[PDB]
Swiss-Prot record, chain B:
Localization, UniProt: Nucleus; Nucleus, Nucleolus; Cell membrane
UniProt-recorded name of the protein: Neurofibromin
UniProt-reported outcome of changing L242P: In FSNF; no cafe-au-lait macules; null mutation; 50% reduction of protein level
Chain's role: Stimulates the GTPase activity of Ras. NF1 shows greater affinity for Ras GAP, but lower specific activity. May be a regulator of Ras activity.
Parent-protein start and end of this portion: 1847 to 2272 of 2839
Gene name of the encoded protein: NF1
Amino acid sequence: PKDVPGTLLNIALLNLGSSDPSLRSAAYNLLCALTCTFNLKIEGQLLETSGLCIPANNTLFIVSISKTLAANEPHLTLEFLEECISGFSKSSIELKHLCLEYMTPWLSNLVRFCKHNDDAKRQRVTAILDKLITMTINEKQM
Amino acid sequence: PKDVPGTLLNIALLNLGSSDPSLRSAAYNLLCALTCTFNLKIEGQLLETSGLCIPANNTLFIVSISKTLAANEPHLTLEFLEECISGFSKSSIELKHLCLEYMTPWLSNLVRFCKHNDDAKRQRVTAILDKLITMTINEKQMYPSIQAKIWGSLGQITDLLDVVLDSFIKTSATGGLGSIKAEVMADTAVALASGNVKLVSSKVIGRMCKIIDKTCLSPTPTLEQHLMWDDIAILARYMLMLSFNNSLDVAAHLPYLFHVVTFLVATGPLSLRASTHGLVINIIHSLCTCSQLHFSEETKQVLRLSLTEFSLPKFYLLFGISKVKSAAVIAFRSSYRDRSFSPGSYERETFALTSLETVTEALLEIMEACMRDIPTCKWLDQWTELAQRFAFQYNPSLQPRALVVFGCISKRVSHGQIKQIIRILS
């Protein structure tokens, strides 16, 4: 589990915007564990709880967390985007609109990895770019 | 033609993103005539021509023109928006996404017309806001984007909250308690309250305290039978949604939030009683994770233990939602945007004033723990004043509950007060 902090972070954010009230609460608890275990620096404070009522409208709250971790936690970028794009194709139309909202703040971090001494990381950004090209071709309504 | 520059401009921009190359060229030329006739100040230069080849991908070009005219041509705002929304409903899905892109910059200009000397212009901005509410209800696939674009920005405009909030309540009132229009407007305010947490909360609480205070004019045997029950039921769903993530600003409103809870514990349909339990859980959770307050490490342990007690089966009984596995499931419904829930099981349990003591004495402990680390706190004095005002006034639906609370949180009593209590018994 300590080798994939970026993979679990996408599962937490994606399911915070769900339409099932129980599914939101468990997603909030998962996000609290990471911020403690991995010492991730977020803006506010979080506390695990049972019985929370989390509103269905959660777009702006999710983006604030995503927009903050991206600014001051760049080393999750490659794991996050590879998983964020993968979850894009497995979700419904309404959730497809959400992933675009909190995905964009991370695209700006690909600069740090574009010329990373050809350490096979440069070979991965080219893989990420290929995924974005596939989405553009298929989704004609958005 | 000189009386409707705003209406012609929307036809130009909307058709500039068509999928037909011939239609795109006609749109470019029409946009050039407007800029010449009306001397509109755009960034670049334009020139009419025949035979231009215009790419189908044109979003960023269209938005730049709209984003500029909005900044330095405000006098088109009321004509443009009225026509932009109207053509929004006549277009296909793909074009609908474009209308949101270049519509957003024009919303900031409504400040200049909100208080325009009641010249019937104030009557139009309220008309426009009604149209936006109608769009939000119908288009459910674009919902995550409308919140972050339309309602997200309007929250940050301080001068416009009062009018925007006012229209929200009226729309919900017509629908009714379980209506769709009321459920959306309750869930939509969360986006609105993000920009100004303090101003939106004080207004929603301000209105809830006054409606209860106005039940004294026409007393009724119970609160539900009153004529203002609907106005108090929908406004409770607004507070439920704003409680999460400390959007009610507990740091300055705690005395009143406890005050409303006591008058609402265990009253109404099972879906409303599950909301009052959830509201308390969210308020306590907000105290623990609030930064404006500096609680000692000892006190935080007191709150965290209380946060667990309220979820025990003992307290599900006090709030009247026994036989319920989880309150969160009952409070919310997945199909709120689709249909309107039909209330059932009109049979409702009776409430005993001995249960109101146990709840009213668990909350008092919570408040006192917080007052130790807050110098010169006035939470308890403010709460006591509200209790007095309702204890010694005739209202068959509220007076019994105010008396039970008044003797529980009061720290002093004089002969005169003890005289009035006996007189009430007489």
